[PDB]
Amino acid sequence: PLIVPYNLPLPGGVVPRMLITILGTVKPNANRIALDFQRGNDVAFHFNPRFNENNRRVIVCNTKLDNNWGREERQSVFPFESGKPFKIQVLVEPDHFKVAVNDAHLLQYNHRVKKLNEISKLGISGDIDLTSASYTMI
Ligand SMILES: OC[C@H]1O[C@@H](S[C@@H]2O[C@H](CO)[C@H](O)[C@H](O)[C@@H]2O)[C@@H](O)[C@@H](O)[C@H]1O
Numbered sequence: 001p002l003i004v005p006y007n008l009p010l011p012g013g014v015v016p017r018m019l020i021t022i023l024g025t026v027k028p029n030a031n032r033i034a035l036d037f038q039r040g041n042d043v044a045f046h047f048n049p050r051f052n053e054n055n056r057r058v059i060v061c062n063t064k065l066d067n068n069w070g071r072e073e074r075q076s077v078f079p080f081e082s083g084k085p086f087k088i089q090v091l092v093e094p095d096h097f098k099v100a101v102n103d104a105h106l107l108q109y110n111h112r113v114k115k116l117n118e119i120s121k122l123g124i125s126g127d128i129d130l131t132s133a134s135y136t137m138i
C-alpha cells in the first residue's frame with residue numbers, strides 16, 4: 001500500500017537489461033495513470049493511460065525537454081480495466097523502453113533522451129492503489 005505519487009530512485013539511471021516492475025490495482029472510475037521516467041526536470045519517458053479521452057481509452061507516451069512536451073506517440077491497445085489488478089513491466093533495451101502489461105507485450109518507445117544513466121527517478125501517479133515498485137537486472 002505505497003503512497004501515490006510514489007518516487008522510485010533508479011541509482012545510476014537505467015541501462016539495457018534493467019527490468020522495472022509496477023504492481024497495483026486501478027481504482028473504480030479511474031481517469032488516468034502516469035509513469036514518469038525522469039532525467040532531472042526532464043521526462044525521458046512518460047507513459048500515460050487515459051481512461052476517458054473523448055469517451056475513448058488510450059495510452060499516451062511522450063518526452064518533456066526543458067519543460068516542453070514533444071510529439072506524442074499513441075497506442076489504442078488498452079489493457080487496463082477500472083477496478084482490476086495489473087502488472088506493468090518496463091524492460092530497458094538498447095533502442096527503446098519495452099512495455100508489457102499482465103505478461104502481454106504492449107508497446108515500445110524509442111529513446112529520445114540518450115543519457116540513459118541520468119534517468120535516475122521513476123514517478124508513479126494517478127488513480128491506482130500501488131502495491132509495489134521495484135527493479136532487477138536480467
Ligand atoms: O503529451 C503528454 C502530456 O499531455 C498533456 S495534455 C496536452 O497538452 C498539450 C499542450 O501542452 C496540448 O494542449 C494537447 O492538446 C493536450 O492538452 C498533459 O496531460 C501532460 O500531463 C502529458 O500527458
Ligand SMILES: [Cl-]
Binds near residue numbers: 112113115
Ligand atoms: Cl540526452
